[PDB]
Enzyme design. Structure first.
Site, mmCIF file in Angstrom:
data_model
loop_
_atom_site.group_PDB
_atom_site.id
_atom_site.type_symbol
_atom_site.label_atom_id
_atom_site.label_comp_id
_atom_site.label_asym_id
_atom_site.label_seq_id
_atom_site.Cartn_x
_atom_site.Cartn_y
_atom_site.Cartn_z
ATOM 1 N N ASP A 54 44.772 53.805 38.903
ATOM 2 C CA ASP A 54 45.719 53.109 39.768
ATOM 3 C C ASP A 54 45.562 51.615 39.540
ATOM 4 O O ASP A 54 46.532 50.855 39.509
ATOM 5 C CB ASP A 54 45.426 53.408 41.264
ATOM 6 C CG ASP A 54 45.667 54.864 41.636
ATOM 7 O OD1 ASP A 54 46.746 55.358 41.291
ATOM 8 O OD2 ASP A 54 44.801 55.522 42.282
ATOM 9 N N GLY A 72 41.979 28.737 30.263
ATOM 10 C CA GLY A 72 40.636 28.240 29.920
ATOM 11 C C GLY A 72 39.707 28.075 31.130
ATOM 12 O O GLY A 72 40.064 28.409 32.258
ATOM 13 N N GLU A 97 35.906 31.875 32.193
ATOM 14 C CA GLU A 97 34.952 31.480 33.222
ATOM 15 C C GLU A 97 33.606 32.089 32.854
ATOM 16 O O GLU A 97 33.508 33.017 32.045
ATOM 17 C CB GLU A 97 35.358 32.028 34.594
ATOM 18 C CG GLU A 97 36.844 31.957 34.897
ATOM 19 C CD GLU A 97 37.398 30.544 34.772
ATOM 20 O OE1 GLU A 97 36.609 29.583 34.676
ATOM 21 O OE2 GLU A 97 38.624 30.385 34.796
ATOM 22 N N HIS A 114 38.544 38.980 46.450
ATOM 23 C CA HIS A 114 39.792 38.246 46.617
ATOM 24 C C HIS A 114 40.911 38.912 45.853
ATOM 25 O O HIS A 114 41.988 39.123 46.407
ATOM 26 C CB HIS A 114 39.616 36.808 46.141
ATOM 27 C CG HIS A 114 40.853 35.974 46.255
ATOM 28 N ND1 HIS A 114 41.091 35.138 47.327
ATOM 29 C CD2 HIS A 114 41.923 35.846 45.431
ATOM 30 C CE1 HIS A 114 42.251 34.531 47.158
ATOM 31 N NE2 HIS A 114 42.776 34.945 46.017
ATOM 32 N N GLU A 115 40.660 39.263 44.592
ATOM 33 C CA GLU A 115 41.676 39.893 43.724
ATOM 34 C C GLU A 115 42.056 41.309 44.181
ATOM 35 O O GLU A 115 43.220 41.687 44.146
ATOM 36 C CB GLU A 115 41.222 39.922 42.259
ATOM 37 C CG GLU A 115 40.854 38.577 41.685
ATOM 38 C CD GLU A 115 41.997 37.589 41.746
ATOM 39 O OE1 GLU A 115 43.161 37.989 41.600
ATOM 40 O OE2 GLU A 115 41.743 36.400 41.899
HETATM 41 O O1 LIG Z 1 43.992 35.019 42.708
HETATM 42 C C1 LIG Z 1 44.134 33.786 42.896
HETATM 43 O O2 LIG Z 1 44.687 33.244 43.888
HETATM 44 C C2 LIG Z 1 43.576 32.902 41.780
HETATM 45 C C3 LIG Z 1 42.065 32.597 41.892
HETATM 46 O O3 LIG Z 1 41.694 31.460 41.079
HETATM 47 C C4 LIG Z 1 41.455 32.449 43.303
HETATM 48 C C5 LIG Z 1 40.030 33.039 43.371
HETATM 49 C C6 LIG Z 1 39.298 32.987 44.702
HETATM 50 C C7 LIG Z 1 39.895 32.521 45.897
HETATM 51 C C8 LIG Z 1 39.184 32.481 47.120
HETATM 52 C C9 LIG Z 1 37.865 32.915 47.127
HETATM 53 C C10 LIG Z 1 37.265 33.380 45.947
HETATM 54 C C11 LIG Z 1 37.958 33.427 44.741
HETATM 55 C C12 LIG Z 1 35.819 33.786 46.196
HETATM 56 C C13 LIG Z 1 35.681 33.490 47.698
HETATM 57 C C14 LIG Z 1 34.532 33.683 48.505
HETATM 58 C C15 LIG Z 1 34.587 33.346 49.882
HETATM 59 C C16 LIG Z 1 35.794 32.828 50.413
HETATM 60 C C17 LIG Z 1 36.941 32.647 49.584
HETATM 61 C C18 LIG Z 1 36.872 32.985 48.221
HETATM 62 CA CA LIG Z 2 40.702 29.626 34.149
HETATM 63 ZN ZN LIG Z 3 44.764 34.717 45.292
#
Ligand SMILES: O=C(O)C[C@@H](O)CCc1ccc2c(c1)Cc1ccccc1-2
Ligand SMILES: [Ca+2]
Ligand SMILES: [Zn+2]
Ligand SMILES: [Zn+2]
Length: 163
Positions: A54, A72, A97, A114-115
């Site tokens: 999925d 990058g 990264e 988050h993803e």
């Molecule tokens: O998917 C997106 O919007 C793109 C990305 O660069 C955002 C990644 C990201 C965005 C927010 C956060 C984290 C990662 C890890 C985290 C820990 C605790 C609180 C917030 C976040």
């Molecule tokens: Ca990047």
């Molecule tokens: Zn996001």
């Protein structure tokens, strides 16, 4: 209303692996990230190694076939597609990264949580405490907890866990 997975049993498969952490550590960061969401909804996540899943987890750099080229090191760390068929639900991590088990660089677990939120159907939050806040920020992975906004957002989509 917006797209949601229409079943509670969801599969994921790791397409490929970053060289930045061993296999065990990639597997655990991802497993643990699904677990954060499964703890607050009726959803069940299982890893498969063959067949179409999925949710496909992919490590890629620059352009990689989805009209959403990575950029990058730094900037966008990853991106994901909401529930749908085909590419729907997939999570892509920018191989440029440096992925770590902790704060040595870009934490994979936190970024995956988050993803996966995106893969489940969640958009961004304006609450700075939320994991769905648009901006990455490190927090000790043993101290990490979804914020109240993350929980209400996800439960509005799938409900809460059962009796
Ligand atoms: O998917 C997106 O919007 C793109 C990305 O660069 C955002 C990644 C990201 C965005 C927010 C956060 C984290 C990662 C890890 C985290 C820990 C605790 C609180 C917030 C976040
Ligand atoms: Ca990047
Ligand atoms: Zn996001
Ligand atoms: Zn992509």
């Amino acid at each position: 209303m917006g797209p949601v997975w229409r079943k509670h049993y969801i599969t994921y498969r790791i397409n490929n692996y970053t060289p930045d952490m061993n296999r065990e550590d990639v597997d655990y960061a991802i497993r643990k990230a699904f677990q954060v969401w499964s703890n607050v909804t009726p959803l069940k996540f299982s890893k498969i190694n063959t067949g179409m899943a999925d949710i496909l987890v992919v490590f890629a750099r620059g352009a990689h076939g989805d009209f959403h080229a990575f950029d990058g090191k730094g900037g966008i760390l990853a991106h994901a597609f909401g529930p749908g068929s085909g590419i729907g639900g997939d999570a892509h991590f920018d191989e440029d990264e440096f992925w770590t088990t902790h704060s040595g660089g870009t934490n994979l677990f936190l970024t995956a949580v988050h993803e996966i939120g995106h893969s489940l159907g969640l958009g961004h939050s304006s609450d700075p405490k939320a994991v769905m806040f648009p901006t990455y920020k490190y927090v000790d992975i043993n101290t990490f907890r979804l914020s109240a906004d993350d929980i209400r957002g996800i439960q509005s989509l799938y409900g809460d866990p059962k009796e």
